[PDB]
Amino acid sequence: SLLEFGKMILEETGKLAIPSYSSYGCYCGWGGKGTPKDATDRCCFVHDCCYGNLPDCNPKSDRYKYKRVNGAIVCEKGTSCENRICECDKAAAICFRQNLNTYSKKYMLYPDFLCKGELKC
Ligand SMILES: Oc1ccc(/C=C/c2cc(O)cc(O)c2)cc1
């Protein structure tokens, strides 16, 4: 679910999902178009594609369970949708962690019309 994703993001990065990742760049948050602005935005692009791979799941609302083993996120076994949603969220949270070094506050609330270019999943 979205709230679980937000808590996984906070755990990984120490940033609050809202506002750090809810409206960042072209792809983090509602909507997506154009060329992602940086590596963090690319995490969101791929996360969007990952949710797009699950057309008959409901990634915003369906809850999954995970634990940590030696620090690392381990998605626990629910329904097939829940497992797949968890893997998408896990990847994006790790990706955010990996790209904290280049996160730029200039891309928070980035305006949609600047999202020029095109990117297929
Ligand atoms: O690819 C994406 C990556 C991150 C997000 C952020 C989502 C989000 C939205 C909420 O209302 C609450 C929340 O805790 C998280 C959306 C798309």
3-state secondary structure 30-49: CCCCCCCCCHHHHHHHHHHH
HSE, CB side, 13 Å, CA atoms: give it for residue 41.
22
Q: Which residues are catalytic?
A: 47, 89
Closest CA to 51 of 20, 95, 90: 90
How far is the CA of 119 from the CAs of 22, 35, 36, 42, 66, in angstroms? 20, 6, 8, 10, 31
Are 108 and 19 spatial neighbours (Cβ–Cβ below 8 Å)?
yes
* Deposited experimental method: X-ray
Instruction: Please give the structure tokens belonging to residue 81.
Output: 């949708």
HSE, CB side, 13 Å, CA atoms: give it for residue 7.
10
Whose alpha carbon is nearest atom 13 of ligand 1? 6
Cα(109) to centroid(ligand 1), Å: 13
Resolution (A): 1.2
Cα(70) to centroid(ligand 1), Å: 26
Please tell me the distance from the alpha carbon of residue 113 to that of residue 47, in angstroms, as a whole number.
21
Are 34 and 117 spatial neighbours (Cβ–Cβ below 8 Å)?
yes
Are 32 and 96 spatial neighbours (Cβ–Cβ below 8 Å)?
no
| Domains in the chain, CATH or no CATH each | 1-121 (1.20.90.10)
Q: Which protein residues are within 6 Å of ligand 1, measured from CB?
A: 2-3, 5-6, 17-18, 21-22, 27-29, 44, 47-48, 92
Closest CA to 86 of 61, 57, 64: 64
Residues 6+ away with beta carbon under 8 Å from 6:
16, 17, 18
Residue type, 62: D
